[PDB]
């Protein structure tokens, strides 16, 4: 019965949709970007990529059993880490750059140390305890990491102890994505049940739940201000949710776009929204005007991952073609 | 690259590229096989005879050919979210137990449904399937003890192994909808070791030859 109460509470706050208020704002115009760097060397499908905090180094993971740290400026390969399992699904870069984490169909998450005295990359910790495939992971600090798995649950792990201190439960379907808030106090996850849930890291309990998607949610990302987030699903629509309002603001979709989103990201100011599609083309959407401002068609197979530098200078894209492209 | 300590970085990158290419050129000449089947389908026997908690990889060599087999039944998760990761495998191995009438979740019907779902999957349009029918010895006693009509009310053949096995094989092979695109290889598992590996090698060789003929434009 509480669902009806929640519906009544939410419907009363929607006096005017964000589309009506945005009618006064001028359009963003046309945005066009070109490929300045082509990162090659991977021989299989690439699944995950994450920009470093310095906005120069990035790490990408491929199903060939290798994840490479790339120097985005000179395109030089800094490290080549041979993995024990080639079925990777996600990768992450530590904020301090001291450690790198990756995982996939194996039910464990591996963390690698880059600043070893011997000079070679070595395994630091293997976080076991999950039963389903690892889906996503993001570092909070050098000693804390939050991971997602296909077991429909998320857990917080202490690398030093090597066990999950807290467990997050409540999702019906497998969790497909995870994103940390700017202050790291909260994080959100998307699941196959088409609902997005906000979880409290400190208390380890769900605070809010969001729905509206007609199919599985594949990607999720916070708005730079942290008061809203966007999700990507197989619906071929992007939906933005506001935490304080607890209601959807708008949905970005087009009749032409079959085979909906696979990845989502925001610019530094959040004016434009970048999403990766199964059409191996990345479409740039105006977060306020809800219009497509450009298309980064530079791949052949599929856009699996993409990310915007913390500085906002450039945006990198990954693909099943085994090549990465950086746009500006 | 002009400055010092930058040419050394370029040399390091070149060495990394050389190592990556050398590693890649070795994996390309390895046959990848996907292993499927229920927990009670008898998959463990195949690994046991070849060798004599997530994805499990088995490596073996037969007549100068290298094989890699991946078991995906270890982890329980949404299949459609990760099945595409195995796209491009040479062939798919499917295991079914003939005597799988002990419990009703009907396990034979579940196996048939799983076979239909995997065979007609979009990611495996051109991928052939190798079907292993295990527990023939137990099925020999089961057919005498219990009738085959218990699972197939429409069955009208004699209650004998020679007819029951053929009926099951025909029923399983009829599920595929794209016979012009792929072929199904059926083998009855035997206690002796050599038959299984030899059959797998023969199927792989036939698939390779047929693919080459198709590329040439003859097949």
């Amino acid at each position, epitope marked *: 019965q509480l669902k009806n109460q929640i519906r009544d509470a939410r419907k009363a706050c929607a006096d005017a949709t964000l589309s009506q208020i945005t009618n006064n704002i001028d359009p963003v115009g046309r945005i066009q970007m070109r490929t300045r760097r082509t990162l090659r060397g991977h021989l299989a499908k690439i699944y995950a990529m994450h920009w470093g905090t310095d906005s120069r180094l990035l790490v990408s993971a491929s199903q060939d059993g290798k994840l490479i740290i790339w120097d985005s400026y000179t395109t030089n390969k800094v490290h080549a880490i041979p993995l024990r399992s080639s079925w990777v699904m996600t990768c992450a870069y530590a904020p301090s750059g001291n450690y790198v984490a990756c995982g996939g169909l194996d039910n464990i998450c591996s963390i690698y140390n880059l600043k070893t005295r011997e000079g070679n990359v070595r395994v630091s910790r293997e976080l076991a305890g999950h039963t389903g495939y690892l889906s996503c992971c993001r570092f909070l600090d050098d000693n804390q990491i939050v991971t997602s798995s296909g077991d429909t649950t998320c857990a917080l792990w202490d690398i030093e102890t090597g066990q999950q201190t807290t467990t997050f439960t409540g999702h019906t379907g497998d969790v497909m994505s995870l994103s940390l808030a700017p202050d790291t106090r909260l994080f959100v996850s998307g699941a196959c049940d088409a609902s997005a849930k906000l979880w409290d890291v400190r208390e380890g309990m769900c605070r809010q739940t969001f729905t509206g998607h007609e199919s599985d949610i594949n990607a999720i990302c916070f708005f730079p201000n942290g008061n809203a987030f966007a999700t990507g699903s197989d619906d071929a629509t992007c939906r933005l949710f506001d935490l304080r309002a607890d209601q959807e603001l708008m949905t970005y979709s087009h009749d032409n776009i079959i085979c909906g989103i696979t990845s989502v990201s925001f610019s530094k100011s959040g004016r434009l929204l970048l999403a990766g599609y199964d059409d191996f083309n990345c479409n740039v959407w105006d977060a306020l005007k809800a219009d497509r401002a450009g298309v980064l068609a530079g791949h052949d197979n599929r856009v699996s991952c993409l990310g915007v530098t913390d500085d906002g200078m450039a945006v990198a894209t990954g693909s099943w073609d085994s090549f990465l492209k950086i746009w500006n | 690259t002009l*400055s010092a300590e930058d040419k050394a970085a370029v040399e390091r990158s070149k060495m990394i590229d050389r190592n990556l290419r050398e590693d890649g050129e070795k994996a390309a000449r390895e046959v990848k096989l996907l292993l499927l089947g229920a927990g009670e389908s008898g998959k463990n026997t195949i690994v046991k005879q070849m060798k004599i908690t997530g994805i499990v990889e088995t490596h073996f060599t037969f007549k100068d050919l290298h094989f890699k087999m991946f078991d995906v039944g270890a982890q329980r998760s949404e299949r459609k979210k990760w099945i595409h990761c195995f796209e491009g495998v040479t062939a798919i191995i499917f295991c079914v137990a003939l005597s799988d009438y002990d419990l009703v979740l009907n396990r034979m019907h579940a196996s048939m449904k799983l076979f239909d779902s995997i065979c007609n999957n979009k990611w495996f349009t051109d991928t052939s399937i190798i079907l292993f029918l295990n527990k023939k010895d137990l099925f020999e006693e089961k057919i005498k003890k219990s009738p085959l009509t218990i699972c197939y009310p429409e069955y009208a053949g004699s209650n004998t192994y020679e007819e029951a096995a053929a009926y099951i094989q025909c029923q399983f092979e009829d599920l595929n909808k794209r016979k012009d695109t792929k072929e199904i290889y059926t083998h009855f598992t035997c206690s002796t070791d050599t038959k299984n590996v030899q059959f797998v090698f023969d199927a792989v060789t036939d698939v390779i030859i047929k693919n080459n003929l198709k590329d040439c434009g003859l097949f």
Partner: single-chain antibody
Amino acid sequence: QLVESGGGLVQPGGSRKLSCSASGFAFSSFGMHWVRQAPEKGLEWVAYISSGSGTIYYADTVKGRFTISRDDPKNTLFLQMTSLRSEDTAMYYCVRSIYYYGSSPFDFWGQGTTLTVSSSDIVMTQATSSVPVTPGESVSISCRSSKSLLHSNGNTYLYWFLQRPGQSPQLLIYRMSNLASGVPDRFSGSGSGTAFTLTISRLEAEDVGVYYCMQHLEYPLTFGAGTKLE
């Protein structure tokens, strides 16, 4: 750790072969340098070989007379010498180095060996030879170069080394702004263009030694005259 061997008494015009053994780290991925120190003078770079033996360099004073080679399987380094001269007498040190974005070259130095024989480059200038110091005081060391070390990419290739009495040189600051791992926070370095300085806060007896500056903008590598603190 690094241990060098091959020293002893040699006569002019003879031949000798130094050897160095490395363990505890991935020798194959680290480039090796040879640096020799005369018995009563400063440091002098000898030769360098990159990882994989793809590049080799020699100094003019020893070009053609010496030879450098690697045996990665055994983590061993060699330095063949021929036609030894009177000036070749010096203590030879093996130096570990690696080159990648964010790396710290010359971070480790070997113990070294003694060799005894009977009988356009960038110049690094240190104005002060000796500086009296006492515990608790702040001390500054000045350096200058005949050529600008600020490359177009923005990197300033200045290195600072400290050689305590009876000990081999140890890396202090690299690229003029980065403290080597394990170096106390007290040490700090800053500079611009052709002038550079090193500053120590709350100096202690452990800081006694000779401070050497080096440049890595281009070969050959040149060390400074060195400043003594006591």
